[PDB]
C-alpha cells in the first residue's frame, strides 16, 4: 500500500479519458507531435531547407502546407533543440528543419504509447489483445517510411514531409526514382488495403441486408439491444446468398472476423518490407530480359518500356527543384521530351 | 489497359493530365479505401478480441462457433467497454446494426466519389 | 497500334511479355469512339492490329 | 520409460487446404515474373 | 527472351514444396475421421 500502488490506482481510475501508465508516455508525445505539425503548418517556412513556402502565414492553404524535412546537409542529425546545429536558438531550430525530427520522434514514441495503451486497457478489461496486435501494422509503415527509409539514404531530407501535397510529391518521387508500382511488396500492400475496403463494405452490407425482423418499425437500428444473446442477422441466409451468387461464402463467424484483421494488417506489413528495400535503393526497377530485347530490337515496346520513359521524364523535370542542394543545371537541350510537347 | 503495367501507365498519364492527386474526390477515395482498411481491421480485431471462451489452447478458437448457432459468439459489451475506453465511451458503438451500416457506408461512399 | 501512329505495342505472353507487363492493349486512336466489332474488319488480322479484342472484352 | 505424453494430432481441414493452395498459387503467379526477370 | 534459367526451378519448387506440405496434412486429417 505504498506510493506505487496508490499512483497505479489513480492512473487506472475509470474517467472520461482513461490515463493508465501508458498515458504518461502517450499523452505528452501525441499532444506534442500534433502541436508541432499545427505550429509548423501555420507559421514555419521551408525557405532555407527546401526553397519552399509551407505555412499559412506565407500564403499556403491546407493542401500545400507542410512541416518539411531538414536540409540534406544535416545528414541524419537528431536536430535536438539543444544540440550543435541550432545551439538552443528556437528560431534557427525552426528554420533548420528541427520540427520535423521533433514531430517524427515524438510521433514514434506516441505510437508506442498508443499501442501500450491498447495492451493496458485490454488487460484491465479482460479481453484478448488483438486490437494492439493489429496496430503493429500502422507502426511498421510509419517507422519504415519515416525512419528506416531516410536512414538508408543520405539524410532526413528524403523522408516524406508532413503535408498533403508534400506526401503527393513523395508518391511521385517513388514512381520515377524507385518504380515503386512494379514492386510486388507494394502490390501485396495494395491488395491488402483494397482487400480490406472490400471486406469492410461487403461485410457491413451483408449484415445489414440479412437482418432479422426484431422490431415493428421501418428503422431497423432500434430493434438491436447490446445485451441480447441472439445474433441479429442470419448467418445462414447470408451463407446461402453468397454461395449462390459468388460460389463460396463464409460459414464461420470467427474466421470471418479474423480474416478481417488478417488481410489489411498483412498487406501493410508487406509494403513496409518493400520500403525497407527502397531504403537501400534495392528497387524492383527493371526486367532484364525486356531491357536486353528492347536494346537490340527497336520495334519492341511494352507498357513496361513506356512507363520508364515516364519515370525518366519525372526524374529530369523534377530533380533540380526537388533536390536544390545538388545544383542540378539541366539546359533545355538535355531534357527528355517527346515530339511537340 | 487490361494489364498490371498498363494500369500503372494509365494512372501515371492521368496524373499529368488531370492532377488527380489534387482532386478532392480522389482524396475521399483514398479516405474511403484507407478508412475501410482501418475499420476492417478494427471490427475484425475488436470482434476477435471479445470471443467467448469455448475451446482449449490445443484447438483453433474458430471451432467455438457452429454454423447457424443462435447466440452471438463474442461479447459486444466487453468490446464496447474496451474501445470506448481506448478513445472515450461515445466514440464507440454498442448497436451492432449501426456499426455494420457504418462499415458498409464509409468505403461505399468514398468509392462512389473516386468513381 | 493503341495510339494510331502505326507503333504497335506488344501485350501478350507469346510476344515477349510476362504476367506483370502483359495486357490486352486498348483499341486504336484511329478508331476513337467508333464501334469496331469483328464483322466490320476486312479480316481478323486487321481487327487484331487495331485492338478489336479490347472493345469486345 | 513411459511414452511421451505431449504428442498431439495436427489437423488441416479442406477449406484451409483450398485457402493455402490459393495463396501459394497466387504468390507463385506474382513472383515468377521476378524470378525469370 | 533472355530469362534467368533458375527462374524455372525456383518457380516449380516455390509451388510444389508448400503445396505438398498442405496436401500431406489434409489427407492424414481426413483418414482420422
Amino acid at each position: 500500500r505504498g506510493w506505487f500502488d496508490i499512483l497505479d490506482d489513480w492512473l487506472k481510475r475509470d474517467r472520461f479519458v482513461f490515463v493508465g501508465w501508458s498515458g504518461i508516455l502517450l499523452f505528452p508525445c501525441a499532444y506534442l507531435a500534433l502541436g508541432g505539425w499545427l505550429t509548423g503548418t501555420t507559421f514555419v517556412t521551408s525557405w532555407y531547407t527546401h526553397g519552399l513556402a509551407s505555412s499559412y502565414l506565407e500564403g499556403c492553404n491546407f493542401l500545400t502546407v507542410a512541416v518539411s524535412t531538414p536540409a540534406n546537409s544535416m545528414g541524419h542529425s537528431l536536430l535536438l533543440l539543444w544540440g550543435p546545429e541550432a545551439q538552443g536558438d528556437f528560431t534557427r531550430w525552426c528554420q533548420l528543419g528541427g520540427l520535423w525530427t521533433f514531430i517524427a520522434l515524438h510521433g514514434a514514441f506516441g505510437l508506442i504509447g498508443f499501442m501500450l495503451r491498447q495492451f493496458e486497457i485490454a488487460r484491465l478489461v479482460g479481453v484478448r489483445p488483438y486490437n494492439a496486435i493489429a496496430f503493429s501494422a500502422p507502426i511498421a509503415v510509419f517507422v519504415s517510411v519515416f525512419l528506416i527509409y531516410p536512414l538508408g539514404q543520405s539524410s532526413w531530407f528524403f523522408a516524406p514531409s508532413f503535408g498533403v501535397a508534400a506526401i503527393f510529391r513523395f508518391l511521385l518521387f517513388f514512381q520515377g526514382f524507385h518504380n515503386w508500382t512494379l514492386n510486388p511488396f507494394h502490390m501485396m500492400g495494395v491488395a491488402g488495403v483494397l482487400g480490406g475496403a472490400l471486406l469492410c463494405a461487403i461485410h457491413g452490407a451483408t449484415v445489414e441486408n440479412t437482418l432479422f425482423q426484431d422490431g415493428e418499425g421501418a428503422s431497423t437500428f432500434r430493434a438491436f439491444n447490446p445485451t441480447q444473446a441472439e445474433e441479429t442477422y442470419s448467418m445462414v441466409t447470408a451463407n446461402r446468398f453468397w454461395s449462390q451468387i459468388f460460389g463460396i461464402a463464409f460459414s464461420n463467424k470467427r474466421w470471418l472476423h479474423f480474416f478481417m484483421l488478417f488481410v489489411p494488417v498483412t498487406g501493410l506489413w508487406m509494403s513496409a518490407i518493400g520500403v525497407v528495400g527502397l531504403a537501400l535503393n534495392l528497387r524492383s526497377y527493371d526486367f532484364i530480359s525486356q531491357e536486353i530485347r528492347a536494346a537490340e530490337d527497336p520495334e519492341f515496346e511494352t507498357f513496361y518500356t513506356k512507363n520508364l520513359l515516364l519515370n525518366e521524364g519525372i526524374r529530369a523535370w523534377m530533380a533540380p527543384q526537388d533536390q536544390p542542394h545538388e545544383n542540378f543545371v539541366f539546359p533545355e537541350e538535355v531534357l527528355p521530351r517527346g515530339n511537340a510537347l | 489497359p487490361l494489364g498490371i503495367s498498363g494500369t500503372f501507365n494509365f494512372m501515371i498519364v492521368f496524373q499529368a493530365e488531370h492532377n488527380i492527386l489534387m482532386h478532392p474526390f480522389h482524396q475521399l477515395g483514398v479516405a474511403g479505401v484507407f478508412g475501410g482498411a482501418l475499420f476492417c481491421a478494427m471490427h475484425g480485431s475488436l470482434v476477435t478480441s471479445s470471443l467467448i471462451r469455448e475451446t482449449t489452447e490445443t484447438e483453433s478458437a474458430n471451432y467455438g462457433y457452429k454454423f447457424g448457432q443462435e447466440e452471438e459468439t463474442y461479447n459486444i459489451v466487453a468490446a464496447h467497454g474496451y474501445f470506448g475506453r481506448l478513445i472515450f465511451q461515445y466514440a464507440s458503438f454498442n448497436n451492432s446494426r449501426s456499426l455494420h451500416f457504418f462499415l458498409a457506408a464509409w468505403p461505399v461512399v468514398g468509392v462512389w466519389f473516386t468513381a | 497500334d493503341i495510339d494510331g501512329i502505326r507503333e504497335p505495342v506488344s501485350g501478350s505472353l507469346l510476344y515477349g511479355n510476362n504476367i506483370i507487363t502483359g495486357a490486352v492493349v486498348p483499341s486504336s486512336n484511329a478508331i476513337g469512339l467508333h464501334f469496331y466489332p469483328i464483322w466490320e474488319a476486312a479480316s481478323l488480322d486487321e481487327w487484331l492490329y487495331n485492338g478489336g479484342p479490347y472493345q469486345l472484352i | 520409460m513411459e511414452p511421451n505424453p505431449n504428442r498431439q494430432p495436427v489437423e488441416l481441414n479442406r477449406t484451409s487446404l483450398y485457402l493455402g493452395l490459393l495463396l501459394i498459387l497466387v504468390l507463385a503467379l506474382l513472383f515468377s515474373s521476378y524470378f525469370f526477370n | 527472351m533472355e530469362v534467368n534459367q533458375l527462374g524455372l526451378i525456383a518457380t516449380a519448387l516455390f509451388v510444389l514444396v508448400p503445396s505438398v506440405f498442405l496436401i500431406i496434412l489434409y489427407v492424414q486429417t481426413e483418414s482420422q475421421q
Binding site: - | - | - | 479442406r14 490459393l22 498459387l25 515468377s32 525469370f36 | 527462374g7 524455372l8
Partner: peptide
C-alpha cells in the same frame, strides 16, 4: 518455358476454383 509456367499456374488456379465451389466442405447447421 516462362510462358508455359505462367499459363500452367493460371490453369491450376482455375482448377482449384472448380473444386472449391463444387467440392467444398458443405456447411451444416447446429
Amino acid at each position: 518455358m516462362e510462358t508455359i509456367t505462367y499459363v500452367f499456374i493460371f490453369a491450376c488456379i482455375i482448377a482449384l476454383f472448380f473444386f472449391a465451389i463444387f467440392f467444398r466442405e458443405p456447411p451444416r447447421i447446429t
